Design a protein around this ligand. Structure first.
Ligand SMILES: CCCCCCCCCCCCCCCCCC(=O)OC[C@H](COP(=O)(O)OCCN)OC(=O)CCCCCCCCCCCCCCCCC
Ligand SMILES: CCCCCCCCCCCCCCCCCC(=O)OC[C@H](COP(=O)(O)OCCN)OC(=O)CCCCCCCCCCCCCCCCC
Ligand SMILES: CCCCCCCCCCCCCCCCCC(=O)OC[C@H](COP(=O)(O)OCCN)OC(=O)CCCCCCCCCCCCCCCCC
Ligand SMILES: CCCCCCCCCCCCCCCCCC(=O)OC[C@H](COP(=O)(O)OCCN)OC(=O)CCCCCCCCCCCCCCCCC
Ligand SMILES: CCCCCCCCCCCCCCCCCC(=O)OC[C@H](COP(=O)(O)OCCN)OC(=O)CCCCCCCCCCCCCCCCC
Ligand SMILES: CCCCCCCCCCCC(=O)OC[C@H](COP(=O)(O)OCC[N+](C)(C)C)OC(=O)CCCCCCCCCCC
Ligand SMILES: CCCCCCCCCCCC(=O)OC[C@H](COP(=O)(O)OCC[N+](C)(C)C)OC(=O)CCCCCCCCCCC
Ligand SMILES: CCCCCCCCCCCC(=O)OC[C@H](COP(=O)(O)OCC[N+](C)(C)C)OC(=O)CCCCCCCCCCC
Ligand SMILES: CCCCCCCCCCCC(=O)OC[C@H](COP(=O)(O)OCC[N+](C)(C)C)OC(=O)CCCCCCCCCCC
Ligand SMILES: CCCCCCCCCCCC(=O)OC[C@H](COP(=O)(O)OCC[N+](C)(C)C)OC(=O)CCCCCCCCCCC
Ligand SMILES: CCCCCCCCCCCC(=O)OC[C@H](COP(=O)(O)OCC[N+](C)(C)C)OC(=O)CCCCCCCCCCC
Lengths: 90, 69, 491, 158, 71, 642
């Protein structure tokens, strides 16, 4: 039916086991589309708030717009090759 | 008047003052079709249209910011 | 069993068309039923087979999952692994559809040897289709150069006056360049001991060895898709090649290079792609600007469209090398959109006008809307589609590619917007001239568009509009697959 | 309908008026194109050719193939894209966010009440659209905080 | 007077005008057929019979079998 | 009632386009007029609900783009600003359609003219009803496609086929920048929806805001025929008069101003763009009013009149008084549409069908109805108090001095010159065609009559709206404190109070005093003292006349120096690159090198024992030499090839 995301961080696996490495790539992707969807819902509130408030949209939608701009830069598909082929700890 | 060779040139619009012999017969045949289409647009239009300022009341929005604050 | 069915069926079909025709050579004069009506009973078999190949992919389409990550329908045939993912599904689907239209385009404008022509078209279509469903660099190369053998002979046998000049150009430009890709494919086979996609996607190479591999592969790509300054072969080939060859060449073959970027560069040379991306933009944007100014000062009818295809293939490369889903998805949609509008233009220019008046000089023709109104209607519509009109599929590809470039590089990527203005100049100047002023005094009044020629245009126009109005038929499939190519670390 | 005796009638008419340029009952079958003897195959060429030599681009042989083979194929492509029960990845994510919202707020009755009223065709349409539905609580919960474990998939910092 | 005569009588329901509407009418009915068929079969569309999307569990086996051979 | 207002013209446009052959000519014109009439009624119903009862409509059809965060839907919202654009467009277009039934009665192609004419109306309706910037772009492009067909309608006329291409290409230059601006909207904000984007105006950086709106401004310059991109405006007269009666009143011309008005939430927080908008208007108003006074064509003068009157809407935007510009846009759609139709009836009435105003004279008694429509329109165009022009045009000029800035003061004189020039060339046009001694052959006058009732009905309807409409609709837009949040005016930019209170009495009458005095002074000189206006005597006055008559030479500078130069760059690439170095470094160059080398080699293959003996002995030197000297032998071996 609705198959879930097999949460597997790259740091737990050895890339030699190809079946595991596939899981860590798929899991990182499926957690990135959820963030984009949560961006759409957040922006779906900003549109409704802006219209209903009218002239008040600078105060009745202040936090919603502020959160949307804060989350915009990093709520987009980034891919797994960025974190698979890099180790941030070094 | 003159000859414009409309014998073989048969565009979708006729061209060079073209009017078919049975133009009255097809005239209502389109009014019947066109009027039905507009009725479809009025039935589709009213069913699906909405007011974007009334879908969400003011109380619901006044709490959304408190969640995202 | 897709590939196993696909190769075996065509191999069976090729033998069937070989047996029926070449049985009557013998010592006897060719009094035969099969060749009656210009080999009508041997053309129809060839047209049926190209339609059937479309039914083979559809059988495997209904099982395709749009949500599972990785290659699907993984099969081992001829000791080669064949797989289909989101990107390979639409390019195979597009390739097979252009099969029947390539055959049907040359249905009654050949002087002879229709059996040879039919088999050559099918072999080009199948080999192109098989090229998107391989799973190693070596097998990618084999189906990337096997097309030269039928393509070199098709142009020479069924060409225009300068076919000798063009037959060399297609054979040598695509071999003296793709060989530089063989070196880079071989280097992978030496240091990794396998060319399989999934095996080499996970291996990082030194900073220098990625550059040496990128150059060797970009050389074989910058030639296959005409990119300045090695673009000087396609306009000659398009002018001389037959209508079936021109449809397949700019419809599928030039899109192999866009797909070649997806398989050979982005995943396994991911770091060096970011280093080369500013270089690609300078090369691509100047290709867009020059190939649209050059088109202004052209004279030949089919050459004019040839340079038009180059500009809309520079937009694809700009979009695909963007490091975001917006650029990558639009680049792929534009390839699909350009897979129908570009073949359609060659039918109007080199398949209807040339097949009646037998000339390709833009000076003769003007005011064709006076006695060829149906030809003008499809001339104007396919002209506005080719320029990036919003209701067409070109716009969706051209908007997302331009927007995708701006996200990657907002400064130089802004120049990608020149495609919006430049594509309007050279294109409408052709459409304005061909449908303007009094009917030309050099052309006698002849038959208007026939049923066969109308059919091709209607079935090359509808997919373009459908993608333009509602591209979610295409975007939804690609969204998972296109998200894998992106390389970025955000902290 | 090969009718060899009728076939010689056509060639006879050619011989009746040998000069040139100064059919309704004609057909064949698939089995005729293969096993007919050279005597018959030789003659049918003559009758067919000089009938043409007497003289608007119709009956070219492609009509019964493209309209029967190719056109239904494109309809099938049209049918598949529109009516395939496939979740796109973005659509799958939209469903998943609600499911992860349902589990993490089992103490929130109003969210659970509204989720059950969100039909299969109302899942990804959360917004001020034509559809008449109550989803204000759903939007509020999503604005409250994140509902993903992405930071749990990256175990290393700078 | 201009005295321009009328042209030949035309059939507005000719072969080239009816077909576009037939494609339009066919799609709407099939769309409405599919709209109902989902509720009466729990969200499964009219193409339920021709096949179904393959599951992830089945496909991962082919990938694992194929990734062992390549290694 | 929303979906009926938008797509009805599209249905009417298609009926004549494809079924037109089967439904004749006369029965095909009235069906197209029928489809527009439905839309006119539906707009007023919406206008009643939207402006007065504050109800908004939105019909979301289906999604269009779903690429990650970027979502764009085929939706069409109808809010207050949208309806205030539907009133000029849909109402005039019906009158243009009603006018065109009897104007184009003699044209052999009538089933095709009304197919594009209504398609134009639908293309504009989509523009002013899209609820995201991309749907606006779908409409924005299709004004050009519809205009390209209509301007080049008579495709057998060379000056008209070329004129369509000029109108299509210059707009694409504007559309090239609009696409770039749309991209920066997706980059900075992530969406192109009006709701999402406008809600962020106060939180986005100025430079990012400036970059987008500069692109919108360049896009608008092409459509509103402002300075630097106004060559296409006058070249568009090659189309039929109804085309000019529709494009230059409530259509393609005005579409630049609407885009800038829609972007008021973004435009406010960038003072630098509002300065550029203000200065384009002042120059375009000043220049057009000067060119119009020495032009000698009835349609060129009116065409130049629109460019001056559109520029007045630009300066009203530059002072953040968006309400004034929108109101003057609605008014101008009626006393400028009426001018074209009446002028299109003067040309039709005369049997020689001249268009030069120097072949007219003494027509007032012969065609008094067409004169009366022009005279009422001309006074309204001159902003005479009491008429629609006064309630809209004067207040914009009032506020040029009402901002009390240096830039505001300079543009005030440019407006004031154009306010007077509007009063000067308007009198010139009427005097040259209605109060002058006859120039045409006497045979024309004994056949110079009026037209039928169908051609007369629209002009009377527009004539009434050119008197009363400005007064009735003033308080909706220009009222004090009227709620019009669809157009954002920042609190620091509300200078409407100072404009209506701090202007001395002299300014409130100055445009009229110079307009009435200047017109009468010119009227006497034209009548009793015409010897002065033969400009061939004073070489300074001959050079001046020949300068503005050629439209500031901008047509000559654009054609001879940019298009001619631009085409030459394409020739240089074709010669020195495409057929040049890339052919020397290609098949032609490599044929020479191969022929050179293969010529040297074929000499070596010749049966000789002594020849093959020396090379065998020569190769023994490879063993002797230290292998550090291989590169030198390689260099020498190449030398011997030569
Ligand atoms: C030859 C052309 C071939 C075209 C093939 C594609 C045709 C459309 C595809 C099938 C659509 C079937 C259909 O209409 O389903 C009914 C649908 C109900 O869907 P629903 O979501 O409930 O509506 C609310 C949406 N806001 O109702 C709808 O969603 C329809 C909404 C469309 C409203 C705008 C229509 C644009 C105007 C089109 C004019 C030309 C067509 C003439 C139509 C006759 C009626 C005027
Ligand atoms: C009559 C007998 C029929 C053949 C039966 C047979 O011998 O089976 C062998 C093989 C079946 O495949 P199998 O070994 O079971 O495992 C999959 C690996 N292909 O089947 C085969 O090996 C048949 C392969 C021959 C068909 C392809 C011929 C050359 C194709 C050239 C393609 C060019 C582009 C690449
Ligand atoms: C047919 C039409 C085709 C399309 C038209 C042509 C498109 C290219 C021309 C316009 C280029 C797009 C505009 C990009 C420049 C402005 C972008 C911008 O706003 O950012 C400027 C950027 C610094 O960013 P900023 O926020 O402004 O400053 C913060 C400093 N802490 O950095 C800067 O300060 C300057 C950025 C470089 C300036 C070059 C801009 C001109 C580009 C010309 C290309 C070569 C000719
Ligand atoms: C030139 C030759 C003629 C051939 C080409 C003619 C032009 C093509 C016209 C049709 C274009 C094909 C697109 C129609 C197919 C319907 C697309 C669709 O799937 O709609 C999706 C919509 C929302 O998606 P979802 O919630 O996921 O539900 C679908 C699940 N199966 O689900 C729905 O609710 C269905 C909504 C159907 C809406 C009716 C379709 C309206 C199409 C006309 C308006 C196009 C948009 C407006 C553009 C006009 C110019 C501004
Ligand atoms: C396009 C990107 C920028 C390219 C700039 C090219 C400018 C240029 O090359 O100008 C050369 C051209 C005149 O050069 P040429 O024709 O050789 O003069 C011979 C006179 N007997 O001069 C021109 O054609 C005018 C070009 C102006 C460019 C601004
Ligand atoms: C929002 C998007 C809406 C799109 C739908 C618009 C419906 C209108 C279609 C009517 C077609 C028509 O009339 O073309 C057919 C007519 C026929 O000739 P005629 O002019 O009647 O004169 C007839 C006398 N001849 C024979 C001397 C011409 O013209 C032509 O062959 C003129 C050539 C240019 C046609 C350009 C068509 C562009 C279509 C739209 C491109 C996007
Ligand atoms: C997809 C996998 C395909 C694999 C099988 C390929 C079979 C090839 C045909 C063999 C039979 C044959 O040579 O026959 C010749 C056939 C048919 O000639 P015809 O015009 O009917 O002869 C009629 C003669 N009259 C007129 C006198 C009666 O023409 C061909 O040469 C076309 C196909 C091959 C062209 C290019 C070959 C080079 C291939 C290089 C590596 C790909
Ligand atoms: C009342 C409800 C509305 C009525 C209108 C419905 C009309 C349906 C079609 C009937 C007429 C017909 O099929 O014309 C099709 C025409 C005419 O060519 P033909 O048909 O081959 O005839 C000529 C051949 N002859 C001589 C053998 C008879 O082809 C075309 O070039 C169509 C060009 C398409 C232009 C628009 C493209 C879409 C872009 C915009 C997307 C939004
Ligand atoms: C809107 C304005 C349009 C005006 C009409 C323009 C002319 C249209 C015309 O000609 O339509 C032609 C087409 C089919 O072509 P055909 O079989 O040759 O039709 C003429 C039939 N004869 C030759 C027997 C007389 O039919 C249609 O309508 C097609 C509707 C959409 C089909 C969707 C298929 C999708 C496949 C791939 C998607 C990814
Ligand atoms: C404020 C002043 C507004 C201008 C009033 C000038 C009157 C006018 O424009 O007309 C006066 C004259 C001539 O009369 P005409 O109707 O233009 O030509 C009549 C037609 N002939 C000549 C064929 C008979 O023209 C001019 O010398 C125009 C000069 C315009 C530029 C003024 C200075 C530029 C700064
Ligand atoms: C690194 C980037 C790689 C790009 C692709 C390679 C360059 C393109 C060359 C195509 C030439 C062609 O096609 O040869 C065609 C040409 C000439 O043409 P023709 O038919 O005689 O017409 C001309 C007729 N005249 C001259 C009588 C008027 O023949 C030759 O000169 C044959 C020798 C070709 C040498 C190929 C060397 C390749 C080296 C590549 C590595 C640097």
């Amino acid at each position: 039916d609705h198959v879930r995301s097999p949460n597997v961080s790259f740091d737990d696996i050895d890339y030699n086991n190809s079946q595991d490495l596939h899981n860590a790539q798929e899991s990182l992707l499926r957690e990135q589309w959820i963030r984009v969807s949560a961006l759409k819902v957040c922006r779906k509130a900003l549109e409704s708030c802006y219209k209903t408030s009218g002239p008040n949209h600078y105060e009745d939608c202040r936090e919603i717009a502020e959160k949307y701009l804060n989350m915009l830069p990093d709520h987009r598909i980034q891919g797994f090759l960025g974190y698979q082929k890099n180790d941030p700890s070094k | 008047h003159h000859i414009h060779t409309p014998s073989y040139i048969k565009p979708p619009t006729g061209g060079w003052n073209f009017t078919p012999a049975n133009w009255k017969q097809n005239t209502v045949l389109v009014l019947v079709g066109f009027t039905a289409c507009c009725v479809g647009l009025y039935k589709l239009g009213e069913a699906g249209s909405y007011n974007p300022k009334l879908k969400y009341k003011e109380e619901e929005l006044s709490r959304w910011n408190q969640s995202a604050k | 069993m897709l590939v196993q069915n696909l190769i075996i069926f065509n191999i069976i079909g090729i033998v069937l068309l070989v047996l029926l025709n070449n049985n009557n050579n013998g010592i006897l004069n060719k009094k035969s039923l099969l060749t009656i009506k210009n080999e009508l009973k041997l053309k129809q078999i060839g047209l049926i087979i190209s339609i059937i190949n479309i039914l083979i992919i559809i059988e495997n389409w209904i099982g395709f999952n749009s949500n599972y990550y990785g290659f699907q329908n993984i099969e081992r045939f001829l000791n080669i692994y064949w797989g289909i993912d989101g990107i390979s599904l639409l390019l195979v689907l597009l390739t097979l559809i252009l099969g029947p239209i390539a055959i049907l385009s040359n249905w009654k404008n050949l002087k002879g040897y229709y059996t040879y022509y039919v088999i050559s078209i099918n072999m080009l279509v199948i080999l192109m289709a098989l090229n998107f469903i391989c799973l190693d660099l070596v097998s990618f190369y084999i189906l990337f150069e096997s097309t030269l053998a039928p393509l070199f002979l098709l142009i020479g046998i069924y060409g225009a006056n300068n076919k000798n000049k063009a037959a060399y150009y297609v054979l040598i430009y695509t071999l003296a360049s793709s060989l530089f890709m063989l070196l880079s494919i071989v280097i992978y086979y030496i240091i990794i001991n396998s060319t399989d996609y999934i095996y080499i996607n996970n291996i990082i190479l030194s900073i220098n060895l990625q550059s040496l591999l990128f150059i060797g592969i970009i050389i074989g790509i910058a030639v296959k898709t005409p990119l300045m300054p090695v673009h000087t072969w396609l306009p000659t080939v398009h002018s001389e090649s037959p209508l079936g060859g021109s449809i397949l060449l700019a419809g599928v073959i030039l899109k192999l290079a866009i797909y070649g970027v997806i398989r050979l560069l982005l995943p396994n040379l991911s770091e060096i792609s970011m280093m080369f991306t500013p270089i690609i933009y300078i090369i691509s944007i100047l290709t867009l600007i020059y190939s649209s100014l050059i088109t202004l000062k052209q004279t030949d009818l089919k050459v004019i469209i040839a340079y038009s295809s180059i500009s809309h293939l520079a937009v694809c490369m700009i979009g695909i090398f963007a490091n975001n889903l917006i650029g990558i998805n639009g680049s792929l949609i534009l390839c699909l959109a350009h897979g129908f509008v570009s073949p359609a233009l060659f039918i109007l220019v080199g398949g209807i006008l040339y097949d009646r008046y037998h000339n390709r000089l833009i000076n003769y023709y003007q005011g064709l809307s006076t006695f060829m109104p149906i030809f003008s209607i499809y001339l104007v519509v396919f002209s506005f589609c080719n320029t990036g009109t919003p209701l067409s599929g070109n716009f969706v590809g051209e908007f997302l590619s331009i927007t995708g470039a701006v996200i990657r590089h907002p400064i130089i990527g802004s120049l990608t917007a020149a495609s919006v203005l430049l594509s309007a100049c050279y294109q409408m100047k052709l459409t304005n001239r061909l449908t303007g002023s009094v009917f030309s005094q050099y052309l006698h009044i002849t038959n208007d568009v026939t049923n066969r020629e109308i059919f091709l245009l209607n079935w090359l126009l509808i997919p373009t509009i459908i993608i333009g109005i509602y591209p979610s038929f295409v975007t939804n499939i690609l969204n998972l697959a296109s998200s894998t190519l992106i390389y970025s670390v955000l902290i | 309908a090969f009718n060899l005796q009728l076939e010689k009638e056509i060639r006879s008419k050619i011989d009746s008026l040998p000069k040139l340029n100064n059919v309704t009952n004609r057909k064949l079958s698939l089995t005729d194109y293969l096993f007919q003897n050279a005597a018959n195959q030789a003659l049918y060429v003559d009758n067919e050719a000089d009938l043409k030599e007497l003289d608007e681009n119709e009956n070219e042989g492609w009509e019964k193939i493209m309209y029967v083979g190719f056109v239904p194929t494109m309809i099938l492509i049209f049918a598949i894209v529109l009516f395939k029960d496939d979740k796109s990845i973005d659509e799958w994510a939209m469903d998943e966010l609600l499911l992860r919202l349902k589990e993490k707020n089992l103490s929130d009755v109003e969210l659970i009440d509204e989720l059950d009223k969100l039909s299969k065709s109302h899942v990804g349409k959360i917004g001020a659209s034509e559809i008449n539905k109550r989803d204000a609580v759903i939007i509020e919960r999503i604005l409250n905080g994140e509902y993903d474990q992405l930071s749990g998939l990256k175990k290393k910092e700078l | 007077d201009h005295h321009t005569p009328l042209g030949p009588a035309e059939n507005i329901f000719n072969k080239w005008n009816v077909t576009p509407f037939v494609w339009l009418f066919a799609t709407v009915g099939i769309f409405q057929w599919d709209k109902s068929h989902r509720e009466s079969h729990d969200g499964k569309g009219i193409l339920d019979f021709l096949g179904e999307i393959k599951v992830k569990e089945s496909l991962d086996t082919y990938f694992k079998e194929y990734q062992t051979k390549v290694a | 009632m929303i979906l009926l207002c938008i797509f009805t013209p599209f249905l009417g446009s298609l009926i004549s386009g494809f079924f037109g052959r089967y439904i004749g000519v006369n029965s095909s014109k009235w069906i197209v007029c029928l489809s527009i009439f439905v839309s006119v009624v539906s707009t007023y119903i919406l206008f009643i609900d939207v402006i007065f009862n504050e109800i908004e409509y939105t019909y979301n059809i289906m999604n269009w783009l779903n690429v990650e965060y970027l979502v764009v839907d085929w939706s069409f919202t109808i809010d207050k600003l949208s309806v205030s654009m539907l009133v000029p467009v849909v109402t005039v277009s019906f009158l243009v359609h009603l006018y065109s039934v009897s104007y184009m009665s003699h044209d052999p192609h009538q089933q095709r003219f009304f197919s594009y004419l209504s398609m134009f109306t639908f293309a504009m309706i989509v523009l002013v009803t899209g609820d995201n910037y991309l749907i606006l772009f779908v409409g924005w492009e299709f004004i050009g496609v519809a205009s390209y067909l209509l301007i080049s309608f008579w495709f057998t006329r060379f000056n008209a086929v070329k004129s369509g291409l000029s109108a299509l290409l210059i707009n694409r230059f504007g559309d090239a920048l609009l696409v770039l601006g749309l991209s920066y909207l997706v980059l900075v904000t992530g969406s192109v929806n009006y709701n999402t984007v406008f809600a962020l105006g106060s939180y986005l950086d100025v430079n990012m805001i400036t970059v987008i709106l500069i692109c919108f401004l360049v896009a608008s310059m092409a459509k509103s025929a402002q300075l630097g991109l106004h060559s296409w405006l006058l070249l568009a007269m090659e189309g039929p008069t109804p085309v000019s009666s529709l494009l230059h009143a409530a259509c393609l011309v005005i579409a630049g101003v609407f885009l800038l008005m829609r972007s008021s939430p973004l435009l406010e927080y960038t003072p630098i763009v509002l300065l550029l908008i203000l200065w384009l208007g002042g120059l375009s108003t000043l220049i057009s009013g000067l060119i119009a006074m020495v032009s000698n064509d009835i349609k060129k003068i009116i065409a130049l009149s629109t460019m001056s009157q559109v520029g007045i809407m630009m300066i009203a935007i530059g002072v953040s008084c968006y309400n004034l510009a929108l109101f003057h846009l609605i008014c101008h759609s009626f006393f400028k549409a009426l001018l074209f139709m009446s002028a299109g009836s003067v040309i039709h009435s005369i049997i020689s069908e001249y268009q030069d105003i120097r072949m007219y004279g003494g027509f007032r008694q012969f065609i008094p109805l067409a004169y009366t429509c022009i005279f009422i329109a001309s006074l309204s165009l001159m902003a005479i108090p009491g008429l629609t022009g006064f309630y809209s045009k004067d207040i914009i000029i009032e506020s040029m001095y009402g901002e009390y800035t240096f830039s505001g003061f300079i543009i005030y004189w440019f407006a004031l010159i154009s306010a007077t020039c509007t009063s000067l060339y308007s009198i010139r046009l009427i005097y040259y065609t209605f109060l002058n001694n006859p120039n045409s052959p006497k045979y024309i006058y004994i056949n110079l009559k009026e037209n039928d009732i169908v051609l007369i009905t629209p002009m009377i309807i527009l004539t009434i709206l050119s008197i009363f409409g400005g007064y009735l609709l003033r308080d909706i837009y220009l009222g004090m404190g009227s709620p019009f949040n669809e157009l954002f005016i920042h609190p620091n930019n509300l200078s409407l109070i100072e404009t209506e209170f701090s202007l001395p009495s002299i300014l409130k009458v100055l445009p009229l005093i110079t307009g009435l005095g200047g017109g009468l002074i010119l009227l006497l000189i034209y009548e009793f003292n015409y010897s002065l206006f033969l400009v061939y005597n004073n070489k300074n006055l001959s050079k001046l006349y020949s300068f503005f008559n050629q439209k500031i030479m901008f047509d000559q500078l654009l054609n001879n120096l940019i298009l001619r130069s631009g085409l030459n760059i394409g020739w240089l690439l074709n010669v020195h690159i495409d057929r040049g170095i890339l052919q020397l470094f290609g098949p032609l160059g490599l044929w020479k090198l191969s022929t050179f080398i293969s010529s040297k080699l074929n000499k070596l293959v010749f049966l000789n024992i002594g020849f093959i003996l020396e090379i065998i002995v020569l190769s023994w030197l490879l063993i002797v030499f230290k292998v550090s000297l291989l590169k030198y032998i390689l260099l020498l071996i190449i030398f011997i090839i030569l």
